[PDB]
Write an enzyme that holds these catalytic residues in place. Sequence first.
Site, PDB file in Angstrom:
ATOM      1  N   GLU A  63      -2.919  -9.225   4.721  1.00  0.00           N
ATOM      2  CA  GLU A  63      -3.306  -7.893   3.873  1.00  0.00           C
ATOM      3  C   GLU A  63      -1.941  -7.549   3.168  1.00  0.00           C
ATOM      4  O   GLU A  63      -1.094  -7.569   4.130  1.00  0.00           O
ATOM      5  CB  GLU A  63      -4.017  -6.978   4.430  1.00  0.00           C
ATOM      6  CG  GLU A  63      -4.504  -5.825   3.496  1.00  0.00           C
ATOM      7  CD  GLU A  63      -5.629  -6.089   2.669  1.00  0.00           C
ATOM      8  OE1 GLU A  63      -6.535  -7.025   2.927  1.00  0.00           O
ATOM      9  OE2 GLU A  63      -5.369  -5.872   1.416  1.00  0.00           O
ATOM     10  N   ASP A  91      -7.578 -10.094   7.394  1.00  0.00           N
ATOM     11  CA  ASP A  91      -6.159  -9.074   7.311  1.00  0.00           C
ATOM     12  C   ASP A  91      -5.265  -9.415   8.141  1.00  0.00           C
ATOM     13  O   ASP A  91      -4.291  -9.048   7.878  1.00  0.00           O
ATOM     14  CB  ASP A  91      -7.170  -7.770   7.469  1.00  0.00           C
ATOM     15  CG  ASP A  91      -7.875  -7.449   6.558  1.00  0.00           C
ATOM     16  OD1 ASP A  91      -8.050  -7.927   5.416  1.00  0.00           O
ATOM     17  OD2 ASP A  91      -8.556  -6.137   6.583  1.00  0.00           O
ATOM     18  N   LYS A 117     -20.061  -6.546   7.387  1.00  0.00           N
ATOM     19  CA  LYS A 117     -19.322  -7.529   7.465  1.00  0.00           C
ATOM     20  C   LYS A 117     -19.451  -8.719   8.185  1.00  0.00           C
ATOM     21  O   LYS A 117     -19.170  -9.898   7.632  1.00  0.00           O
ATOM     22  CB  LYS A 117     -17.876  -6.932   7.895  1.00  0.00           C
TER      23      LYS A 117
HETATM   24  C1  LIG Z   1       9.981   2.954   8.581  1.00  0.00           C
HETATM   25  C2  LIG Z   1       8.839   1.967   9.067  1.00  0.00           C
HETATM   26  C3  LIG Z   1       8.769   0.909   7.821  1.00  0.00           C
HETATM   27  C4  LIG Z   1       7.702  -0.144   8.505  1.00  0.00           C
HETATM   28  C5  LIG Z   1       7.264  -1.138   7.411  1.00  0.00           C
HETATM   29  C6  LIG Z   1       6.022  -1.952   7.779  1.00  0.00           C
HETATM   30  C7  LIG Z   1       5.280  -2.375   6.603  1.00  0.00           C
HETATM   31  C8  LIG Z   1       5.508  -3.954   6.243  1.00  0.00           C
HETATM   32  C9  LIG Z   1       6.283  -4.001   5.034  1.00  0.00           C
HETATM   33  C10 LIG Z   1       6.188  -5.193   3.926  1.00  0.00           C
HETATM   34  C11 LIG Z   1       7.367  -6.009   3.602  1.00  0.00           C
HETATM   35  C12 LIG Z   1       7.437  -6.423   2.224  1.00  0.00           C
HETATM   36  N1  LIG Z   1       7.658  -7.778   1.971  1.00  0.00           N
HETATM   37  C13 LIG Z   1       7.619  -8.258   0.622  1.00  0.00           C
HETATM   38  C14 LIG Z   1       7.266  -9.762   0.840  1.00  0.00           C
HETATM   39  C15 LIG Z   1       7.896 -10.240   1.950  1.00  0.00           C
HETATM   40  C16 LIG Z   1       7.610  -9.083   2.967  1.00  0.00           C
HETATM   41  O1  LIG Z   1       7.832  -8.881   4.090  1.00  0.00           O
HETATM   42  N2  LIG Z   1       4.986  -6.023   4.237  1.00  0.00           N
HETATM   43  C17 LIG Z   1       3.725  -5.917   3.694  1.00  0.00           C
HETATM   44  C18 LIG Z   1       3.196  -7.160   3.772  1.00  0.00           C
HETATM   45  C19 LIG Z   1       3.327  -7.704   5.067  1.00  0.00           C
HETATM   46  C20 LIG Z   1       4.570  -7.062   5.348  1.00  0.00           C
HETATM   47  O2  LIG Z   1       5.583  -7.221   6.055  1.00  0.00           O
HETATM   48  N3  LIG Z   1       6.374  -4.603   7.159  1.00  0.00           N
HETATM   49  C21 LIG Z   1       7.590  -5.009   7.076  1.00  0.00           C
HETATM   50  C22 LIG Z   1       8.232  -5.550   8.635  1.00  0.00           C
HETATM   51  C23 LIG Z   1       6.896  -5.856   9.527  1.00  0.00           C
HETATM   52  C24 LIG Z   1       5.870  -5.090   8.591  1.00  0.00           C
HETATM   53  O3  LIG Z   1       4.516  -4.676   8.956  1.00  0.00           O
HETATM   54  N4  LIG Z   1       5.220  -1.160   8.554  1.00  0.00           N
HETATM   55  C25 LIG Z   1       4.622  -1.578  10.034  1.00  0.00           C
HETATM   56  C26 LIG Z   1       4.097  -0.061  10.503  1.00  0.00           C
HETATM   57  C27 LIG Z   1       3.804   0.453   9.322  1.00  0.00           C
HETATM   58  C28 LIG Z   1       4.307   0.015   8.198  1.00  0.00           C
HETATM   59  O4  LIG Z   1       4.516   0.977   7.169  1.00  0.00           O
HETATM   60  N5  LIG Z   1       8.389  -1.109   9.788  1.00  0.00           N
HETATM   61  C29 LIG Z   1       9.360  -2.057   9.515  1.00  0.00           C
HETATM   62  C30 LIG Z   1       9.388  -2.957  10.656  1.00  0.00           C
HETATM   63  C31 LIG Z   1       8.815  -1.976  11.698  1.00  0.00           C
HETATM   64  C32 LIG Z   1       8.044  -1.071  11.055  1.00  0.00           C
HETATM   65  O5  LIG Z   1       7.280  -0.271  11.483  1.00  0.00           O
HETATM   66  N6  LIG Z   1       7.549   2.619   9.102  1.00  0.00           N
HETATM   67  C33 LIG Z   1       6.870   3.076   8.037  1.00  0.00           C
HETATM   68  C34 LIG Z   1       5.752   4.282   8.434  1.00  0.00           C
HETATM   69  C35 LIG Z   1       5.594   3.692   9.713  1.00  0.00           C
HETATM   70  C36 LIG Z   1       6.770   3.040  10.266  1.00  0.00           C
HETATM   71  O6  LIG Z   1       7.247   2.824  11.490  1.00  0.00           O
HETATM   72  N1  LIG Z   2     -12.878  -3.968  -4.639  1.00  0.00           N
HETATM   73  C1  LIG Z   2     -11.242  -4.258  -4.438  1.00  0.00           C
HETATM   74  N2  LIG Z   2     -10.227  -3.785  -4.735  1.00  0.00           N
HETATM   75  C2  LIG Z   2      -9.236  -4.177  -4.576  1.00  0.00           C
HETATM   76  N3  LIG Z   2      -8.861  -5.201  -3.737  1.00  0.00           N
HETATM   77  C3  LIG Z   2      -9.979  -6.253  -3.322  1.00  0.00           C
HETATM   78  C4  LIG Z   2     -11.213  -5.531  -3.450  1.00  0.00           C
HETATM   79  N4  LIG Z   2     -12.213  -6.416  -2.968  1.00  0.00           N
HETATM   80  C5  LIG Z   2     -11.396  -7.391  -2.474  1.00  0.00           C
HETATM   81  N5  LIG Z   2     -10.267  -7.203  -2.791  1.00  0.00           N
HETATM   82  C6  LIG Z   2      -9.194  -8.050  -2.188  1.00  0.00           C
HETATM   83  C7  LIG Z   2      -9.138  -8.445  -0.796  1.00  0.00           C
HETATM   84  N6  LIG Z   2      -9.769  -7.245   0.226  1.00  0.00           N
HETATM   85  C8  LIG Z   2      -9.729  -7.285   1.509  1.00  0.00           C
HETATM   86  O1  LIG Z   2      -9.084  -7.877   2.166  1.00  0.00           O
HETATM   87  C9  LIG Z   2     -10.520  -5.986   2.073  1.00  0.00           C
HETATM   88  N7  LIG Z   2     -11.161  -4.755   1.058  1.00  0.00           N
HETATM   89  C10 LIG Z   2     -11.728  -3.769   1.443  1.00  0.00           C
HETATM   90  C11 LIG Z   2     -12.459  -2.895   0.579  1.00  0.00           C
HETATM   91  C12 LIG Z   2     -13.205  -3.357  -0.487  1.00  0.00           C
HETATM   92  C13 LIG Z   2     -13.914  -2.325  -1.296  1.00  0.00           C
HETATM   93  C14 LIG Z   2     -13.403  -1.273  -1.466  1.00  0.00           C
HETATM   94  C15 LIG Z   2     -12.555  -0.550  -0.580  1.00  0.00           C
HETATM   95  C16 LIG Z   2     -11.968  -1.564   0.458  1.00  0.00           C
HETATM   96  C17 LIG Z   2     -10.973  -0.942   1.346  1.00  0.00           C
HETATM   97  F1  LIG Z   2     -11.230  -1.030   2.698  1.00  0.00           F
HETATM   98  F2  LIG Z   2      -9.793  -1.651   1.044  1.00  0.00           F
HETATM   99  F3  LIG Z   2     -10.454   0.284   0.891  1.00  0.00           F
HETATM  100  N8  LIG Z   2     -11.711  -3.480   3.059  1.00  0.00           N
HETATM  101  C18 LIG Z   2     -11.225  -4.515   3.924  1.00  0.00           C
HETATM  102  O2  LIG Z   2     -11.285  -4.174   5.194  1.00  0.00           O
HETATM  103  C19 LIG Z   2     -10.602  -5.578   3.443  1.00  0.00           C
HETATM  104  O3  LIG Z   2      -9.957  -6.602   4.524  1.00  0.00           O
HETATM  105 MN   LIG Z   3     -10.066  -5.198   6.122  1.00  0.00          MN
HETATM  106 MN   LIG Z   4      -8.207  -7.462   3.621  1.00  0.00          MN
END
Ligand SMILES: C[C@H](C[C@@H](C[C@H](C[C@@H](C[C@@H](CCN1CCCC1=O)N1CCCC1=O)N1CCCC1=O)N1CCCC1=O)N1CCCC1=O)N1CCCC1=O
Ligand SMILES: Nc1ncnc2c1ncn2CCNC(=O)c1nc(-c2ccccc2C(F)(F)F)[nH]c(=O)c1O
Ligand SMILES: [Mn+2]
Ligand SMILES: [Mn+2]
Length: 178
Positions: A63, A91, A117
């Site tokens: 996700e 997700d 679901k």
């Molecule tokens: C301070 C700390 C920061 C959190 C950040 C992390 C969210 C997530 C970040 C992005 C990376 C973006 N992009 C761009 C493309 C490639 C890419 O990777 N995305 C989104 C898609 C998947 C992903 O990786 N990341 C980054 C590392 C692993 C992860 O899940 N997380 C995880 C907990 C809740 C949260 O926000 N981090 C960093 C590592 C440990 C940690 O907790 N925070 C913010 C509030 C709570 C907290 O602890």
């Molecule tokens: N209506 C949309 N708007 C933006 N993107 C959309 C989307 N429908 C599909 N997608 C892309 C992929 N979606 C998901 O993967 C996903 N969507 C939901 C969902 C669905 C409807 C309204 C709110 C929600 C949310 F929970 F997030 F708030 N819940 C989940 O648990 C989940 O896994």
């Molecule tokens: Mn979901």
């Molecule tokens: Mn989803």
Amino acid sequence: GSHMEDFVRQCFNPMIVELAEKAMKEYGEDPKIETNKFAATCTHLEVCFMYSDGGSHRFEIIEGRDRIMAWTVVNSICNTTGVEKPKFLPDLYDYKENRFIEIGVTRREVHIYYLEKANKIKSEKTHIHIFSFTGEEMATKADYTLDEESRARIKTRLFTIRQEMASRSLWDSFRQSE
Ligand SMILES: C[C@H](C[C@@H](C[C@H](C[C@@H](C[C@@H](CCN1CCCC1=O)N1CCCC1=O)N1CCCC1=O)N1CCCC1=O)N1CCCC1=O)N1CCCC1=O
Ligand SMILES: Nc1ncnc2c1ncn2CCNC(=O)c1nc(-c2ccccc2C(F)(F)F)[nH]c(=O)c1O
Ligand SMILES: [Mn+2]
Ligand SMILES: [Mn+2]
């Protein structure tokens, strides 16, 4: 400009808000108008991230990414582990349990949302994990993947968000919109 939009932006970390905005505009929806759906997209996003930060490189986050790259990773997991390609985008993915996860966050009874679901995905493969804003949860085959402490943490966060909405008189519209 609504009270809900300002709350969302003050309640959630900026990276989560931007990702939720990007997702919605991908589907033609305006976070400035569908503001309760805005808050919901962020919570689900935060829950998924807290979920991924609850195990040991155990989960692959699906996700949050753009549609095409999300599917690219799904295909790469499917052509590595053998698991069949899901009908819909999941997700997460568990390298430990070897299954996709669908995370759910609902304002209704946990039973109803899980049933919807499950009937939607139909395939017995992708694991389902539902959280509510009241602290209940329900997971496929009663298998809750993580340790109780990390899951209880998510339920606490959901309930704090719910209380924060309430103090601002936004909760009733939010609950009455799912
Ligand atoms: C301070 C700390 C920061 C959190 C950040 C992390 C969210 C997530 C970040 C992005 C990376 C973006 N992009 C761009 C493309 C490639 C890419 O990777 N995305 C989104 C898609 C998947 C992903 O990786 N990341 C980054 C590392 C692993 C992860 O899940 N997380 C995880 C907990 C809740 C949260 O926000 N981090 C960093 C590592 C440990 C940690 O907790 N925070 C913010 C509030 C709570 C907290 O602890
Ligand atoms: N209506 C949309 N708007 C933006 N993107 C959309 C989307 N429908 C599909 N997608 C892309 C992929 N979606 C998901 O993967 C996903 N969507 C939901 C969902 C669905 C409807 C309204 C709110 C929600 C949310 F929970 F997030 F708030 N819940 C989940 O648990 C989940 O896994
Ligand atoms: Mn979901
Ligand atoms: Mn989803």
